């Protein structure tokens, strides 16, 4: 769902 999210990057980094």
């Amino acid at each position, epitope marked *: *769902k*999210h*990057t*980094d």
Partner: antibody
Amino acid sequence: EVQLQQSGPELVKPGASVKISCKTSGYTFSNSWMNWVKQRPGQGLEWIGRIYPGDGDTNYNGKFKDKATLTTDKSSSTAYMRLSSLTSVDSAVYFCARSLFDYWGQGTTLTVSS
Amino acid sequence: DVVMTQTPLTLSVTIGQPASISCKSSQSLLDSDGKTYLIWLLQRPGQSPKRLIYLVSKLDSGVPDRFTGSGSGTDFTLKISRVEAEDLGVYYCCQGTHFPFTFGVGTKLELKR
């Protein structure tokens, strides 16, 4: 270090459009989501939406789906937000913010006025 | 949309003393991958926001150890063990589990006198 550098302040008339930029450095631009956030004068933060630059995938807040258009230019590591058919209520500071809001731009002030 | 309710709206703090602020979600923020996408941001006056805490309790790089984040179900807390002047500003909680992502209204930390 990651840095998000936004374009400068804008003053436009109602009905106009504007395109604000967010130039990134210090990481692989294509591989992180870019969010945009609105802050009306004296008010709180509002999420507009996000774009994944590698493939153009987007998620919008429905409140803004007819107002904001997110794009990117991977070759210059720059994210863009276009705001259309502007009215007074679109006057705000707009921020770009990466991924899980982990790095933020310095903000762009938009003033819409006749 | 998920509603994030922050209280108090203003907290009058004292340099050297603890502070605690609360953020409650209208929905569970636990995602199917096990992560809880709850973050805390500080917006100092005249500045852009900065992230301090993410995934409920993890401190961002460079954030002082005086900050702690916790959560139980939909009830989240940010604590400062001893307030310092650089901590003053508006604290926002934000959730990134459910679309659209949403922010609380902000809690302002100001100085008591």
